[model samples]
Target: EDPFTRYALAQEHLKHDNASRALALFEELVETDPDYVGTYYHLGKLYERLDRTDDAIDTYAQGIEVAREEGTQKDLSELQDAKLKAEGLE
Candidate 1:
């Protein structure tokens, strides 16, 4: 439950234009808190902002994997869309 706080903190840093710290925190969340589906979205966005489309795509798919099995298709759908969008690459 408290990890959610760190998640928001990580997201906050990302929104505040601080990817290095956001990247660190988000990466920690993905590793230490895998089932936290939302981590993938912002991390993917951060990866895209950092010019790593492949990572963004992969992160979205990874979350999709978890959501289909552990959570909901709503999350899966969002992750899928993110993956597809990353592949398109603006």
Candidate 2:
């Protein structure tokens, strides 16, 4: 029930330019709650910002699969775009 609240906190951390803090929270969400599609998207972007390009690619790949199953098509497309960019394919 409070998962989104925690997710919101992670977003707040990002707003404060605390990517490391946000990364921890986002990591926890993805590990414990695979259904949280937004977590993967934001986490993947953070990986890119942190210069973890390979990690970003992997994160987006996993997110694309999850988004295809439980998340919206828009989310899947977004992840797909992120993945391509992460790979320098776009």
| C-alpha lDDT values of all predictions | 0.84, 0.88
Per-residue alpha-carbon lDDT of candidate 1 for residues 2-72, written as tens digits (9 for 90 to 100): 67999999878877888899899898999998998888888898888888878888898888878878767
> Weakest 10 consecutive residues, lDDT, candidate 2?
81-90
**63: Cα error in model 1, Å:** 0.6
What would the per-residue lDDT of candidate 2 be over residues 12-40, giving only the tens digit for each residue?
Answer: 99999998899999999998898889988
Residue 35 miss distance in model 1 (angstroms): 1.3
TM-score per candidate, chains pooled: 0.87, 0.92
Q: Which residue runs does candidate 1 get wrong by more than 4 Å? A: none
Candidate 1 has which clashing residue pairs, if any? Answer: none
Which ranges of candidate 2 are over 4 A from the true structure?
A: none
Candidate 2 Cα lDDT to native: 0.88
RMSD of 2: 1.7
Supply candidate 2's per-residue lDDT for 62: 89
Error of 1 at 38 (Å): 0.9
Give per-residue lDDT, candidate 1, residue 58: 85
